[PDB]
Design a protein that fits this description.
1277 residues, alpha+beta, Zincin-like, Clostridium botulinum neurotoxin B, "coiled-coil" domain, Jelly Rolls, 4 domains, 9-stranded antiparallel beta sheet, binds zinc ion, host cytoplasm, host cytoplasmic vesicle, metalloendopeptidase activity, host synapse
C-alpha cells in the first residue's frame, strides 16, 4: 500500500526495508534480495524457485499443462535490470490498487491480516509460527527474524501462472481455520492476458478491434483478494470445486474452478454457489473465530517477543474484529462477524474492483483467456496509476482503447502462447469421417448437478421468537461506500521485534490438490452437424491459399478454401465474382452495405411478447435451429422457446418444500400472535430461498450457455467479416498496379467499417439472447419452484388457520383479523423480483420489459404460431388437436369447433408445474364467436365448450341459448355460476354471431366475475366455495349440444394465475383487438375483394341503394330494412340487404387481403351483377359530395381513393371507416349520408372528419361491412 520510498534494485541493502531476506524455504537457501514496500509487505524480484523444490526448473515441459494459456521464458527476470523494472511495476500496481476506495480498504486488511500466533506452545501460551516470518540479513552479517504478511515473488516456470502460495503447518490449516498465514504471491507485472468482449458493445458502440488486455491491477487485485482470505484464514478448501460434467461432445473435457475462485471473482460467478453451501462456510469460519477468541481468551503468557501479551491479544483483537469486555475477555459478535466476513468475502472481489478501476475486463471467471502479452507498465506514457492504459487525453479512454491490444498495439507485444491451439481438444465427427479438432477451452461449461446443494426440504418449527429474514444487499457501490466510511484506517500493527528464529526457517508449502491431467483426443462420432462444425466452416486457411470463395453448405469445410456463411446467396455472389478495378470501390460499398445489411436483420415478432428482437441468421450461423421441423429458425424458436438454444437442458430439482411446525403457546396472546407472524414471515422468506435458488441454477446451467453462444456468434460474424476481407482482398491483391488510384482500398478501414457493422450486430444479437435467458428462466425454471411454494403456501394456510382456531379464546379479540391476515397473505404469491438476486443492468433491464407485458404472465397462452397451435407460455406439454378442428385460413388463430366429437382440442399442462391451489384465484379470457340459435332445440340446452374438471373440479365454460356461463364447483360439488345473457330479439345485436372478448376472474376470497368485452357483466360471491381441484388438462370441445349444427369460434384463449383487474382486463382487451386491422360486422379482418353489405350504424333501418348508375346518378339509403325471425327465437333486423360493397386494393397489394387501418383503397359498388366505382366530383357545390357509382373506366381523375380507417387520428376507435380523398391527396371527407330533399344520398362530407376529431358520436359515417356468414342463417335475397 502506497509504498513510501521509491526503490531501485541496486540501492544498497540496509538491514531494513531493503535487505537480504531468507524466505522460509526447505533445506538451505542462499538469501535473496527483497524490498519492503510497506509494513508487512515485501517484494522479491526473483522467480519463485525457492518456495517449491520441485519448481526450480524454469523451462517448459515437453508436455503441455492443460491450461488455455501459458508462457515460458527461462530467462525472464534474470538481469538486474529486469528486477528493477519488476520492482517498479509491482509497486505501481499497489499504488494503483491503493488509489481506489476499494483498494485502500483491502490493503489495510491485508496488512492487518497478521497470521495468528499459533505455534501452539502449551495451550495457554502464544507464539509465532516461524513459517510466518522471515530472516532478514543485516549488513553486519547478522540477522533478525521478522514477521511477514504478504510477499510478492516473481513467477515460477509458467510466467503467467499467478497464484497464492503459503507454507503449511504440521497440523494446522492456517488458511482455513482462521489463523491465516503469510502469503507468497507469484505474480508478474510484465505479462498479461488478452481477452475478448462481446457485451460492452451495448454501452460502447465502437468497442475495440479485437482482443483486449487485462489491466494488471485487477490481476494483482485478484491475487490479493486471495491473500486476504488466507491471511484471515478464511480460504475455502480447495477440495471444494464446482464439478463439471465432461462426457459429451459439447462439454468441457476438463476444468475445475474452485469455490474460492468463484468467490474471489465475485460477479455472478460467485452466485453459482448455492445458499446452503454459502452459509455452510460462514458458520464454519464463524466458528473458527470463536475458537480464535477462546484460544486467545485463555492465553496467559506469550513466548517470543518483548511485546505485551496485551499488545498481541489486541492485534488479533483488531484483526478479527473481536469484541472484548472490561475484564478483557474476547467474544465473536455474530453481527460484527457477518460484516468482516462479508467484506473479506463479497466486497473485496475482482468484479468489484473492475468498478473502481474503470477498465474493461472479463465478466466472469469462466471466460478463458486467449492470449499473453508483453506489457511495460513502468513508463507513464504507457500506464498510469490513475488511468492505466486508458490514458487521459490519449485516444485511449473512449472505449477502453488503451486496453485494446490492436488499437493500443504499441503497448502490447503479442507473445507466443505455449498451448498451441489444439493441445487439449475433442474430436467431433459428423455421421469421409468428417471430424474436427475442437478446443477444450472452447466447449461448454456444464455444471454437475451435484454442485447445487439445497436443503429446501427440511421442515421447520416456528417458535414465537424465531429470527426473521435478512436482505440480500447486492453489494452496491453504496454499500461499499458505507463500509469505507465506517472503515478504520488508522493504526497499523507495529513491527514487533521477535526473537531470532532458526537461521534457516524450515518451509514446506501448503498442499494444493493434485492436478489430475485430463484425457485428450477423445473422439465423438455424431449425427447432425454441430454448432462447432458450422463455426469451424467459417474460418478458412490463413491466406497463402487460393482466393477463397464464400459458399454455403457445410461441405464448405472440405475444400482448402473451406468457407461458409449464413448470409443471403446474393452476398455470396457479389463476393464470389471478379470485379474490374475500374469498378472496385463500388463493390466495397456494396458488400459493406450488404454486410451491415445482412448482419443487422432483426425480426420484430411483435405478436409474440416474450422474445421480441430476433436475429434469424443465428440458426444458420451456428446451426442453432438444432434441426427441427426443418429450417425457419425464427419459427423454430417460436415453437419451442429459448430452449432451442441450449446445448443442454438444465433440470431444476425443487423438492417438496417442507412445512412449518407451529409451536403453540398456552394462554399467551402475544407469544402466540407472534408465532403466526413469524410463520408468515418465514414463509415470505421461504419464497425468497426458492427464487434465489433457481436463480443460482439458472445462472450457471442456463445463462452460461447463452453467453457462450453470445461469444460464438461474435465469433461467427468475425469469421465472415474476416473472409469478406480476404476475398475482397485477393482481388485488389491482383490490382492494376496503379498508384494514386483510390485512397487505398484501406483494408484497415474497410475493417474499421466491418467492425461497426458487427458491433451493432452484436447489440441486436445480445438483446435477443438476453431475452432467451431471462425468458427461459421465467417459463422454464420459475414455474417449477413456484409450484412447490404455492403448495407450501397452500398448506401453511391451513396449518395457520388451524393454529389460530386451536388458540382462540386466547386470540379473543383477534381471532378474526389474524384469520384474515393469514388468509389474506397466503392468497397471493411473492412476486419474483430479479433485482433481488442480480445487479446485472443488462438482464434486469430485460426482466423489466418482460414483466410489463401481462401476457408473459399467463400460465397458458396459445396462439396459432408459425404452423402450430402452441402454448407460448410453455406450460402445456401436449396440445392434442382433433381432426374436425378447423382453423380459419386467414387468421388461423381463430379456431372453430363443431358439435362433432372429433373436433376438439385438449390441453394438458405439465404436471410438475401444476399446483392444485391453482384455481383459487385466477382468470381466464378468450374471444368467442357464437353462431345464432335458429332452432328451438337450442333453447334450454346448455352445452359445454371449455371444461377443466377432475371430478367436480370447478370451472368449465358452457353455452346456452343467448348466454355464456362460467361455473365454479368444488369437490364438495358445491357449484357457483356467473352468467352473461344476451337477447336474440334485437334489431342489431352486439353479440350475435360476433366476436366477443370474454374474461372471467376468480378470487377465492371473493367473487367470480364475468367480463364481456371489457365491462363487468356480473359477479357472484365465491367466498363460500370449498377447495377446488387443479385439472391437469383442459378440453376444448362442446359437450351436450343437442343441436347438430352447433359450433363456435374461439380465439386467443389465455389463462392467468391471478385475478386480472379492471384495468388489466381492458388493456388485455384492447390489445387483442387488432385495431390496426379493420373488421367484419362480425369481427373478422375486413378484406379485399369480398362483397359486403353496408349497414349504416346511424340509420340501421335503411340500406344503401344505387339510384342510378353514372355521375348523373346517386346512391342513397333506401327504405325499410327488412326484418328476420323465427318466432320464439330471434327477431333481428335483416342485414344482407341492399347493394354490396367491394374493396379494391390500391396501395400495397399482392400481400394479404386484409384491410389495414390506413390503406388507400377502392370501393366498387356492385350494381346489377356489375361492378361500378364509387366516386364523386370534388368540385361539386357544398361540403357534401353525393357520390355515384361510375363505370370503372370512366372514372378518371375523379375522387375515388378512399382511405380506410380503424383508429381515429387521435387514436380512438371510430366506426367512420371510409374517408374519400381527391387525387391531389386531399381529404374530401368521410363517407356518410345526407338528406337532399328527403332522399339522403350517400355523401362524402368533410363534416365528419371534423367531428370525428372532437367527439366519438356514432355518426352518419359509422359504417359496418357485412359479409354473409354461416352464423347468420339469413338468406341473401
Ligand atoms: Zn484466483
Amino acid at each position: 500500500p502506497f509504498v513510501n520510498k521509491q526503490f531501485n534494485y541496486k540501492d544498497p541493502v540496509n538491514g531494513v526495508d531493503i535487505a537480504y531476506i531468507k524466505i522460509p524455504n526447505a533445506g538451505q537457501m542462499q538469501p535473496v534480495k527483497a524490498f519492503k514496500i510497506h509494513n508487512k509487505i515485501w517484494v522479491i524480484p526473483e522467480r519463485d524457485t525457492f518456495t517449491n523444490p520441485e519448481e526450480g526448473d524454469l523451462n517448459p515441459p515437453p508436455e503441455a499443462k492443460q491450461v488455455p494459456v501459458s508462457y515460458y521464458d527461462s530467462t525472464y527476470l534474470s538481469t538486474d535490470n529486469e528486477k528493477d523494472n519488476y520492482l517498479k511495476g509491482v509497486t505501481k500496481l499497489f499504488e494503483r490498487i491503493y488509489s481506489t476506495d476499494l483498494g485502500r480498504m483491502l490493503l489495510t486488511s491485508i496488512v492487518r491480516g497478521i497470521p495468528f500466533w499459533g505455534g501452539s506452545t502449551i495451550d495457554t501460551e502464544l507464539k509465532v509460527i516461524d513459517t510466518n516470518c522471515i530472516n532478514v540479513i543485516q549488513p553486519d552479517g547478522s540477522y533478525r527474524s521478522e514477521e511477514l504478511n504478504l510477499v510478492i515473488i516473481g513467477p515460477s516456470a509458467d510466467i503467467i501462472q499467478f497464484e497464492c502460495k503459503s507454507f503449511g503447518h504440521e497440523v494446522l490449516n492456517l488458511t482455513r481455520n482462521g489463523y491465516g498465514s503469510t502469503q507468497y504471491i507469484r505474480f508478474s507485472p510484465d505479462f498479461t492476458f488478452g481477452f475478448e468482449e462481446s457485451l460492452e458493445v451495448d454501452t460502447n458502440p465502437l468497442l475495440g478491434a479485437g482482443k483486449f488486455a487485462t489491466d494488471p491491477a485487477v490481476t494483482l487485485a485478484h491475487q490479493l483478494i486471495h491473500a486476504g482470505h488466507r491471511l484471515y484464514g478464511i480460504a475455502i478448501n480447495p477440495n471444494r470445486v464446482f464439478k463439471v460434467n465432461t462426457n459429451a461432445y459439447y462439454e468441457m473435457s476438463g476444468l475445475e474452478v474452485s469455490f474460492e475462485e468463484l468467490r474471489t471473482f465475485g460477479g455472478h460467478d460467485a452466485k453459482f454457489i448455492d445458499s446452503l453451501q454459502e452459509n455452510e462456510f460462514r458458520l464454519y469460519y464463524y466458528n473458527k473465530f470463536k475458537d480464535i477468541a477462546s484460544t486467545l481468551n485463555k492465553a496467559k503468557s506469550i513466548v517470543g517477543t518483548t511485546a505485551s501479551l496485551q499488545y498481541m491479544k489486541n492485534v488479533f483483537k483488531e484483526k478479527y474484529l473481536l469484541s472484548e469486555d472490561t475484564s478483557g475477555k474476547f467474544s465473536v459478535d455474530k453481527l460484527k462477524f457477518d460484516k468482516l466476513y462479508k467484506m473479506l468475502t463479497e466486497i473485496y472481489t475482482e468484479d468489484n474492483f473492475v468498478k473502481f478501476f474503470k477498465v474493461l475486463n472479463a465478466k466472469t471467471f469462466l471466460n478463458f483467456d486467449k492470449a499473453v502479452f508483453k506489457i511495460n507498465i513502468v513508463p507513464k506514457v504507457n500506464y498510469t496509476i490513475y488511468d492505466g492504459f486508458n490514458l487521459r487525453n490519449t485516444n485511449l479512454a473512449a472505449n477502453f482503447n488503451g486496453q485494446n491490444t490492436e488499437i493500443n498495439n504499441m503497448n502490447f507485444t503479442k507473445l507466443k502462447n505455449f498451448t498451441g491451439l489444439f493441445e487439449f481438444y475433442k474430436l467431433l465427427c459428423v455421421r469421409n469421417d468428417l471430424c474436427i479438432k475442437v478446443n477444450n477451452w472452447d466447449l461448454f461449461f456444464s455444471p454437475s448437478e451435484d454442485n447445487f446443494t439445497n436443503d429446501l426440504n427440511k421442515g421447520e418449527e416456528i417458535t414465537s421468537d424465531t429470527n426473521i429474514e435478512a436482505a440480500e444487499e447486492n453489494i452496491s457501490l453504496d454499500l461499499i461506500q458505507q463500509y469505507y466510511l465506517t472503515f478504520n484506517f488508522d493504526n497499523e500493527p507495529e513491527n514487533i521485534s521477535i526473537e531470532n528464529l532458526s537461521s534457516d526457517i524450515i518451509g514446506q508449502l501448503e498442499l494444493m490438490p493434485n492436478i489430475e491431467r485430463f484425457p485428450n483426443g477423445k473422439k465423438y462420432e455424431l449425427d447432425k452437424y454441430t454448432m462447432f462444425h458450422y463455426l469451424r466452416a467459417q474460418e478458412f486457411e490463413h491466406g497463402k491459399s487460393r482466393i477463397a470463395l464464400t459458399n454455403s453448405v457445410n461441405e464448405a469445410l472440405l475444400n482448402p478454401s473451406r468457407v461458409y456463411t449464413f448470409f443471403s446467396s446474393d452476398y455470396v455472389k457479389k463476393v464470389n465474382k471478379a470485379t474490374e478495378a475500374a469498378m472496385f470501390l463500388g463493390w466495397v460499398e456494396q458488400l459493406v452495405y450488404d454486410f451491415t445489411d445482412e448482419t443487422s436483420e432483426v425480426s420484430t415478432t411483435d405478436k409474440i411478447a416474450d422474445i421480441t428482437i430476433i436475429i434469424p441468421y443465428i440458426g444458420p450461423a451456428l446451426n442453432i435451429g438444432n434441426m427441427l421441423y426443418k429450417d425457419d429458425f425464427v419459427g423454430a424458436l417460436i415453437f419451442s422457446g429459448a430452449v432451442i438454444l441450449l446445448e443442454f437442458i438444465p433440470e431444476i430439482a425443487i423438492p417438496v418444500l417442507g412445512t412449518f411446525a407451529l409451536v403453540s403457546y398456552i394462554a399467551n396472546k402475544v407469544l402466540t400472535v407472534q408465532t403466526i407472524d413469524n410463520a408468515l414471515s418465514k414463509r415470505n422468506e421461504k419464497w425468497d430461498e426458492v427464487y434465489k435458488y433457481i436463480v443460482t441454477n439458472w445462472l450457471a446451467k442456463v445463462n452460461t450457455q447463452i453467453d457462450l453462444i453470445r461469444k460464438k456468434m461474435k465469433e461467427a460474424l468475425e469469421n465472415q467479416a474476416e473472409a469478406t476481407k480476404a476475398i475482397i482482398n485477393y482481388q485488389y491483391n491482383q490490382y492494376t498496379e496503379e498508384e494514386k488510384n483510390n485512397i487505398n482500398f484501406n483494408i484497415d478501414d474497410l475493417s474499421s467499417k466491418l467492425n461497426e457493422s458487427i458491433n451493432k450486430a452484436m447489440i441486436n444479437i445480445n438483446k435477443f439472447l438476453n431475452q432467451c435467458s431471462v425468458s427461459y428462466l421465467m417459463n422454464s425454471m420459475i414455474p417449477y419452484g413456484v409450484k412447490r411454494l404455492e403448495d407450501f403456501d397452500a398448506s401453511l394456510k391451513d396449518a395457520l388457520l388451524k393454529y389460530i382456531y386451536d388458540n382462540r379464546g386466547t386470540l379473543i379479540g383477534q381471532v378474526d383479523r389474524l384469520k384474515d391476515k393469514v388468509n389474506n397473505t397466503l392468497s397471493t404469491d411473492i412476486p419474483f423480483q430479479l433485482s433481488k438476486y442480480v445487479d446485472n443492468q443488462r438482464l434486469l433491464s430485460t426482466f423489466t420489459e418482460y414483466i410489463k407485458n401481462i401476457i408473459n404472465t399467463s400460465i397458458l397462452n396459445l396462439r396459432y404460431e408459425s404452423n402450430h397451435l402452441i402454448d407460448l407460455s410453455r406450460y402445456a406439454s401436449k396440445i392434442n388437436i382433433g381432426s374436425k378442428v378447423n382453423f380459419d385460413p386467414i387468421d388461423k388463430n381463430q379456431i372453430q369447433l363443431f358439435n362433432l366429437e372429433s373436433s376438439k382440442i385438449e390441453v394438458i399442462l405439465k404436471n410438475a408445474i401444476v399446483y392444485n391451489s391453482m384455481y383459487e384465484n385466477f382468470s381466464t379470457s378468450f374471444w368467442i364467436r357464437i353462431p345464432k340459435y335458429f332452432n328451438s332445440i337450442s333453447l334450454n340446452n346448455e352445452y359445454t365448450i371449455i371444461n377443466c374438471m377432475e371430478n367436480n373440479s370447478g370451472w368449465k365454460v358452457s353455452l346456452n341459448y343467448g348466454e355464456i356461463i362460467w361455473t365454479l364447483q368444488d369437490t364438495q360439488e358445491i357449484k357457483q355460476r356467473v352468467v352473461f345473457k344476451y337477447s336474440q330479439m334485437i334489431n342489431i345485436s352486439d353479440y350475435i354471431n360476433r366476436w366477443i372478448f370474454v374474461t372471467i376472474t376468480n378470487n377465492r376470497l371473493n367473487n367470480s366475475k364475468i367480463y364481456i368485452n371489457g365491462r363487468l357483466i356480473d359477479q357472484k360471491p365465491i367466498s363460500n366455495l370449498g377447495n377446488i381441484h387443479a385439472s391437469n388438462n383442459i378440453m376444448f370441445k362442446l359437450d351436450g349440444c343437442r343441436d347438430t349444427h352447433r359450433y363456435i369460434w374461439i380465439k386467443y384463449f389465455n389463462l392467468f394465475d391471478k385475478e386480472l383487474n379492471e384495468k388489466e382486463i381492458k388493456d388485455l382487451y384492447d390489445n387483442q383487438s387488432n385495431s390496426g386491422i379493420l373488421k367484419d360486422f362480425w369481427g373478422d379482418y375486413l378484406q379485399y375483394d369480398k362483397p359486403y353489405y353496408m349497414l349504416n350504424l346511424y340509420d340501421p333501418n335503411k340500406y344503401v341503394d344505387v339510384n342510378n348508375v353514372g355521375i348523373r346518378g346517386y346512391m342513397y339509403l333506401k327504405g325499410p330494412r327488412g326484418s328476420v325471425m323465427t318466432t320464439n327465437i330471434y327477431l333481428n333486423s335483416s342485414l344482407y340487404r341492399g347493394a354490396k360493397f367491394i374493396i379494391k386494393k390500391y396501395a400495397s397489394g399482392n400481400k394479404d387481403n386484409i384491410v389495414r387501418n390506413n390503406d388507400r383503397v377502392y370501393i366498387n359498388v356492385v350494381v346489377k351483377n356489375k361492378e361500378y366505382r364509387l366516386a364523386t366530383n370534388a368540385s361539386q357545390a357544398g361540403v357534401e359530395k353525393i357520390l355515384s357509382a361510375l363505370e370503372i373506366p370512366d372514372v378518371g381523375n375523379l375522387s375515388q381513393v378512399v382511405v380506410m380507417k380503424s383508429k381515429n387520428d387521435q387514436g380512438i376507435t371510430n366506426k367512420c371507416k371510409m374517408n374519400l380523398q381527391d387525387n391531389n391527396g386531399n381529404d374530401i371527407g368521410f363517407i356518410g349520408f345526407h338528406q337532399f330533399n328527403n332522399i339522403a344520398k350517400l355523401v362524402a362530407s368533410n363534416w365528419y372528419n371534423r367531428q370525428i376529431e372532437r367527439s366519438s358520436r356514432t355518426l352518419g359515417c359509422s359504417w359496418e361491412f357485412i359479409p354473409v356468414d354461416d352464423g347468420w342463417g339469413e338468406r341473401p335475397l
